[PDB]
RNA sequence: AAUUAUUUUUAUAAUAAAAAUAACGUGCAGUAAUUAAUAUAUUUAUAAAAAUAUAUUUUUUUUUUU
RNA sequence: UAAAUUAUGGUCAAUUGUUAGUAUUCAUAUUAAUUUUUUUAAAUGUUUUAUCAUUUUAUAAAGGUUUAUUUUUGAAAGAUUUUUUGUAUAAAAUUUUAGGAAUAGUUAAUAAUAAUUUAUAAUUUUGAUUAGAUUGUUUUGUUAAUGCUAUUAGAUGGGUGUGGAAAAAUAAAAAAAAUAAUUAAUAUAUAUCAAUAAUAAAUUAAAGGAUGCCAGCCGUUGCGGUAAUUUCUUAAAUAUUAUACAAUUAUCAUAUUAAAUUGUUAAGUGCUGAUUUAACCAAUAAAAAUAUAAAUAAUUUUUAUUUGUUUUUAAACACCAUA
């Protein structure tokens, strides 16, 4: 149980209006439940959020759940460009070990 | 019930007990009966496995578990291999047969202490100085005692029909210890039990800590 | 008191009690606030402590060290959070302000 | 000094809950009862509720509690409260079963009273040896 | 608060275990059997391994 | 010229909103030359009233005193 | 009816402040206040593994309503071993309601796991069932007070049958199988951005207002009187009643008995009460244990007044004009 301060009046039960997770997923491009009934030729805008876009979700963005034959659309992803450091092998230490660098997509914006 | 009358009832009970001890005056030497067992143990129910059929601590051994038995020796014709070959020799088995047992029962008992895989393998018959014994004759009717030379002549049949359905340790109490590797008369029955673990008390009752004021007894 | 409490009867008066209960409540139960004798030991070792079991401490000329009471302003509660008081569990709790002074 | 049993209880609470003994809860809260039904049409057939009903098992007034000093505790030592009782066989309509009416005592400090209550128990007699009226 | 408070000398001059009063603890016969068997098993526990 | 301390009603093969009421009897109240009091019940439209029936009670000395 | 015995031959006291503990202010305390502060904006990195898998990681909230419980040995602790044998399931006892009554997948017995059976079953006026309120809770507050008052430890039969155990959709962190780190106030927000609102959730430091009124010889010309004048500039609730003086809602209700009541089959009388403090006969006066014993009692009755019953139906008398 959780503490609750007693009150001689009636208690209000708010149900709330949060931002729909479905909308956040749709704009982020990571909605795997949406089925568009009609295929169209019009650019689709998606805003990358904390590197939540990946090959898995982008494949569905290319081939929507409605059942498609081709990536017949333009796909704008605001942000989402990554930069990859070079990789090199540390021979020192206990043994040979790769260091792959990494992708600073969300961590380094394009313009401050 | 009103407790105030307890003293008066105590006086009345004292006087009644004195009148009883004084008037009838018919005590006497009466055989005590075995106390049997009770179904009303306290606590929660017990499972089938542990229903050993005694629910109290009885430190005595009553008559029904006590048996009158005689230590008979049964001789066997065995052959040993000496440098020449197959010298005849004699083998004995200790049997504790009840005084009232029949010769067939004694034979069946001997079947049960024959741990040796070589001794009791073919059908045999018991005999006294050659004279075969009637398998439905009581020991007392033959007069056999422990100082009685009795032999087991093994007829060269095979496939001796056995029934291990009767546990080697079967008393009226109907205990069934799974291990039948030794007879009850041979088992010491008092030895340290390693198949267990001693457990200390890890649940404090009332006292848990810094100061033992009263110990929260109960 | 019930399960954990050692108290067996009300402090001062109770309903009528009978037999061993009356005997215990009247005489035999532990009375820990007694100022003349402490609770009484079993039979073989009460006799040999009979002459140690009187009074509280043999000196009746005790010179009170320590702080003097404050009579104005009179405080109601002395409860402060403390870091090194190992007797705080007892320093808490209402107690009767009745003593020699 | 000598401490109460309240000090021992507070020590136990502090040890188990880590210093959590109380909260100094507000005591003078002004409650109000709001009537919903009609003046003489409460929806029940036996007890009608029109005030603030407090729902304490040991927190109702006038105070009452078990009184462990009665005939049973007076007449034989018990391994545990209520383990051994003395009563009167009241009904034997069930096979191998006796209904025994037993009494105990409740204590009311406010009135310094010792009122005797009654309780009914299904007992077991396998050989049908108990007749109504047996102690 | 009770800064200077003392106790009887019986408390400091009592021997050890003088205060224990003899009370007869009562328990069911089933409890007696259970506890006696448990104590016998604990006594008979074989040493060497952990005992 | 003396003595006086809240509730009611209502709906259709459509199913709660409309109405009304309430708030001690108490105004310009009851025939005062003035008509025994008190209780309980029955009746009558003068009803905050009256009548009838029963019961009790009210005496200030010259009837009675276990 | 015991009758006043002569040693008065021993006086010279008390106080030295040293304690066997509920103590009472009807108005001071006690609360929301005179002194109330302080912050809080969600969107989230547990881990190791043989790798599309497997091993370790069992009580978040709101809602719904709450008996008064719980040592799965079974996992771990944990060892010279070995069991999923190391007795966890039970009981006693304490609840509320201004208009107080019925309850039921029902009780016991059983060669019945998994009840085709048998019984005069079971709960309840000693207050049940349902409904309403509703976690419990010597911890709070108050008092001279066995009085009043207050409260948050928890728990959770259809979401996987997995697991030793469902406690499983959230996690101020109890360190989680290599010493990650171990003299640090960190227990950080600083896991800093992002739709979103202070509605809401938590917490008590001591590094000048009110406020109008009026016929102008009279059309809806919209003049004035008028810069209109008066009311506004510690208390309420109270704990402590733990007692009810008192009577005009009272809140209801044991029948007042040997001097009394009843009489048909029993007495007496025109209804015994005009006279008279007195009334023949029959029935009826006591009769278990126990005074401490905390139910030791019954649940019925009506002598008074009205009203019915009916009432060729009282003759009357008195009321009406039946009773």
mmCIF file of C-alpha atoms (C1' of nucleotides) in Angstrom, chain G residues 98 102 105 113 140 273:
data_model
loop_
_atom_site.group_PDB
_atom_site.id
_atom_site.type_symbol
_atom_site.label_atom_id
_atom_site.label_comp_id
_atom_site.label_asym_id
_atom_site.label_seq_id
_atom_site.Cartn_x
_atom_site.Cartn_y
_atom_site.Cartn_z
ATOM 1 C "C1'" A G 98 -31.666 5.213 15.491
ATOM 2 C "C1'" A G 102 -34.266 -14.985 8.301
ATOM 3 C "C1'" G G 105 -23.494 -25.089 -4.795
ATOM 4 C "C1'" U G 113 -8.839 -39.834 -4.841
ATOM 5 C "C1'" U G 140 -1.422 9.339 17.950
ATOM 6 C "C1'" G G 273 -69.763 1.098 49.517
#
